[PDB]
Write a protein that binds this DNA or RNA. Structure first.
Ligand SMILES: [Mg+2]
Ligand SMILES: [Mg+2]
Lengths: 346, 452
DNA sequence: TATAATGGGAGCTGTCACGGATGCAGG
DNA sequence: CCTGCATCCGTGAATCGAG
């Protein structure tokens, strides 16, 4: 029924870890990572490949997919060849396989346990352009990052180190996904810095600041022009479905004309121009008109040099330039007399 | 209609409220096997797929009534304030105190009146060593300083000149030492008084007995064997690498820690005992000890009679999941079933793909013959849908989308109005919602994440 | 990249009358 | 177990103007 409440129920099933339990899980994870390292030292295979194989057997056959980072394609055939290759190792060596498995299982249990933390953190970041659940899942990504980058030897409670990565993932998400026109994170930090600046000034001056006033309080490199440019960039688009009037019978996009598609006047004028130009090029010979049609690109749609037109007609390039001068000059005299193409000058 | 699921049921599966069973694989629940297309709760899924277990916290300071690996029935009392609510193997979690019984084999002497003592080639704990009508005074047969070593009951006297022991005497129960530690004794002065009957202590046992006759008394060179306990305190940041009743020699590690210091290292030969856990984990599982390299690994699912450890001399009795313990050196099989039960439109698409329309048409045609009104009505409706798909050539699994189409950009335009401002359709925000949640899912799958 | 932090938050309440599907007790 | 009635949810609710 309610996705948020349902996820909160799925979270309340997993109990919270005791200090001993939390240390134990983090211990098995870290030892598991070392086990994968050692198994890589022995087998002579990719640590990432080994990790994904161990991860596959732990999670089960319910999940089988290809991993981008890995070089080989990951399929049940491959993971069985490797698992059997791993279980072909002696007692003291095969031990590490059990350590890696136990580690991944502890990792699953650790991430599953601290999901309550993400919820109680992401609840504060609401209203910034991302939904509640979107924030939670992004904090879950950061939680995963925190688990894999955690070191239990420091005696720090996991919540302390997790919170940093969680906030980091959430903030990165809000910076990336919010704006319809995506803006780089550093530029967003700049714009938000401009927001806190303008708000500080408006709070002290009892009015909204000028471009120059903000330019001052921003420091060096900031003038009124650059401030105005930054604000122009931060402008978000507005919905075309924006209601016009107090009824629902009108929309905003209904009042916006199409500037791209040619009006019937445009297409008709273009056709009239092509016809009148052909009527003008027929006042010449077929040769001296062909020189121009090849020169300006009426035919084939390409403008040619004097060397190519001379390589076609069989005369010298100076003869071609001479013919094009005569043709253009004839068209000038034709224009001066007929007064037809003048209206197309636009 | 096609899958014969109500609006409530199809909702629960599609929006991940409950699972649905594709291939039960012999799984059963509460006495009845798992039927296909049966809806089971998340709790039903964890009890089936991953087996049932529960952890019970123990009150501060109190020890456990049961032992490690002890089979436990439902209602059985694990702790003075805790009662188990399920059947299964009990396990210790985090022992606060580790008691190590160090093995000690020494030789010690004793002099008693011949008429009083009972001649035996050896002596058991509690076994009477002598019966004395008149209280007898044990006398030091050497000069030196007294080192008094007291047990739970019974004592050891080590007389020594300089730093070298000159004599070692044993004092069984019923014998009160008349000297303190560090007292100087000459030859002849009484060390202890044995009043009435005297027996061997409960803890220490006499392995061998060598007797020698001298005058009206006898002297006994006894080869004794006993165990002295030593308690080790364990911190939350420390873990025990040694199982219950394991044998360790000098140098072996018992409890590891963050720093090399505070680490518990076995001083000598002795057995290890765990007490005062953080809690007790009761798991419905089968215990399989191994003395050799194990072939199966933790995380694997196994049917009864599968090759486990020691070249295949030990195998599984029940269906379940393998959890290899290297601490207790035992392969556990957590009682569970490898069952295929899913959620969402992936499960639905599967059920739609497996549907043979001709068969359902025939079944509903035979169903249309039934005298009841409602039977004929619902079967007609279902058959109408089946006939529709069959006549059209459409496949039911096309009602579920693997690839969601994208409307051309000009039909969902992003344009710059008169003032240079931008205006766009809501479909763009909708598609961005889709791509974001899709790409995040692909990343969460790639890196691997808990099923929650 | 490290004190520790671990289950959300605002609901919109003065339309109405239809078809059809769900579910209930009753013969 | 099968009919009948109560009840639930989803769907409609004039045209053109301007705004
Ligand atoms: Mg400035
Ligand atoms: Mg009605």
């Amino acid at each position: 029924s309610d996705p948020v409440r349902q996820y909160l129920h799925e979270i309340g099933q997993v109990p919270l870890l005791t200090l001993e339990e939390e240390v134990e899980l983090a211990r098995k994870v870290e030892e598991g990572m070392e086990a994968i390292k050692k198994l890589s030292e022995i087998t002579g295979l990719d640590p990432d490949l080994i990790r994904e194989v161990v991860r596959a057997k732990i999670l089960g056959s319910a999940r089988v997919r290809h991993i981008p980072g890995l070089k080989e394609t990951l399929d049940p055939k491959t993971v069985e060849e490797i698992d059997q290759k791993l279980k072909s190792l002696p007692k003291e060596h095969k031990r590490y396989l059990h350590i890696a498995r136990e580690g991944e299982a502890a990792r699953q249990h650790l991430i599953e346990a601290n999901l309550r933390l993400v919820v109680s953190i992401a609840k504060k970041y609401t209203g910034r352009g991302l939904s509640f659940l979107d924030l939670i899942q992004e904090g879950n990504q950061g939680l995963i990052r925190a688990v894999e980058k955690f070191e239990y030897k420091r005696r720090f409670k996991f919540s302390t180190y997790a919170t940093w990565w969680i906030r980091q993932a959430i903030n990165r998400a809000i910076a990336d996904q919010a704006r319809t026109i995506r803006i780089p994170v550093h530029m967003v930090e700049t714009i938000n810095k401009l927001s806190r600046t303008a708000r500080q000034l408006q709070q002290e001056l009892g009015r909204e600041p000028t471009y120059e006033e903000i330019a001052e309080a921003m420091g060096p490199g900031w003038d009124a022009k650059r401030v105005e440019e930054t604000l122009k960039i931060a402008q978000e688009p507005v919905s075309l479905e924006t209601p016009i009037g107090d009824e629902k019978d009108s929309f905003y996009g209904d009042f916006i004309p199409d500037e791209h598609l040619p009006s019937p006047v445009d297409a008709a004028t273009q056709s009239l121009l092509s016809e009148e130009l052909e009527k003008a090029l027929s006042k010449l010979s077929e040769r001296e008109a062909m020189v121009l049609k090849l020169r300006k690109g009426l035919i084939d749609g390409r403008e040619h040099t004097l060397e190519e037109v001379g390589a076609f007609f069989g005369v010298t390039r100076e003869r071609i330039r001479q013919i094009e001068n005569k043709a253009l000059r004839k068209l000038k005299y034709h224009e001066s007399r007929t007064r037809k193409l003048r209206d197309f000058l636009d | 209609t096609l899958l014969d699921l109500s609006a409530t049921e199809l909702e629960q599966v599609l929006y991940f409220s409950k699972y649905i069973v594709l291939d039960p694989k012999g799984a059963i629940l509460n006495g009845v096997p798992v039927e296909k297309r049966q809806l089971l709760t998340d709790e039903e899924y964890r009890e089936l797929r991953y087996g049932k277990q529960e952890t019970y916290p123990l009150p501060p300071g109190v020890d456990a009534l049961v032992k490690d690996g002890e089979e436990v029935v439902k209602g059985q009392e694990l702790a003075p304030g805790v009662v188990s609510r399920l059947d299964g193997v009990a396990l210790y979690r985090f022992p606060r105190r580790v008691r190590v019984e160090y093995v000690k084999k020494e030789r010690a002497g004793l002099r008693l009146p011949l008429a009083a003592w009972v001649e035996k080639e050896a002596y058991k704990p509690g076994e009477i060593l002598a019966e004395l009508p008149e209280p007898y005074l044990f006398r030091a047969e050497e000069e030196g300083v007294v080192e008094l070593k007291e047990l739970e009951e019974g004592a050891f006297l080590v007389l020594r000149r300089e730093d070298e022991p000159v004599a070692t005497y044993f004092l069984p129960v019923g014998m009160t030492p008349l000297v303190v530690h560090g007292e100087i004794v000459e030859k002849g002065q009484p060390l202890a008084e044995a009043k009435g009957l005297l027996r061997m202590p409960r803890q220490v046992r006499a392995a061998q007995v060598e007797a020698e006759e001298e005058g009206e008394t006898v002297y006994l060179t006894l080869f004794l064997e006993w165990t002295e306990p030593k308690d080790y305190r364990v911190q939350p940041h420390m873990n025990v690498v040694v199982p219950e009743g394991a044998r360790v020699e000098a140098g072996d590690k018992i409890v590891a820690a963050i720093d090399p210091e505070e680490e518990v290292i076995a001083e000598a030969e002795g057995v290890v005992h765990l007490h005062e856990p953080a809690s007790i984990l009761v798991v419905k599982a089968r215990v399989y000890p191994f003395e050799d390299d194990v072939e199966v690994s933790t995380g694997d699912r196994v049917a009864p009679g599968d090759v486990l450890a020691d070249g295949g001399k030990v195998k599984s009795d029940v269906y379940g999941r393998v959890e290899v313990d290297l601490v207790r050196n035992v392969v556990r099989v957590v009682e569970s079933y490898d069952i295929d039960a899913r959620m969402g439109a992936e499960a639905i698409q599967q059920l739609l793909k497996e549907l043979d329309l001709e068969a359902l048409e025939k079944e509903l045609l035979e169903e249309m013959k039934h005298p009841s009104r409602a039977r004929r009505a619902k079967a007609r409706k279902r058959l109408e849908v089946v006939r529709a798909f069959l006549d059209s050539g459409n496949r039911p699994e096309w009602m579920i989308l693997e690839a969601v189409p994208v409307l051309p950009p000009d039909l969902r335009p992003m344009v710059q109005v008169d003032g240079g401002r931008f205006a766009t359709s809501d479909l763009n925000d909708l598609y961005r919602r889709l791509i974001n949640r899709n790409n995040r899912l692909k990343k969460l799958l790639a890196q691997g994440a808990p099923e929650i």
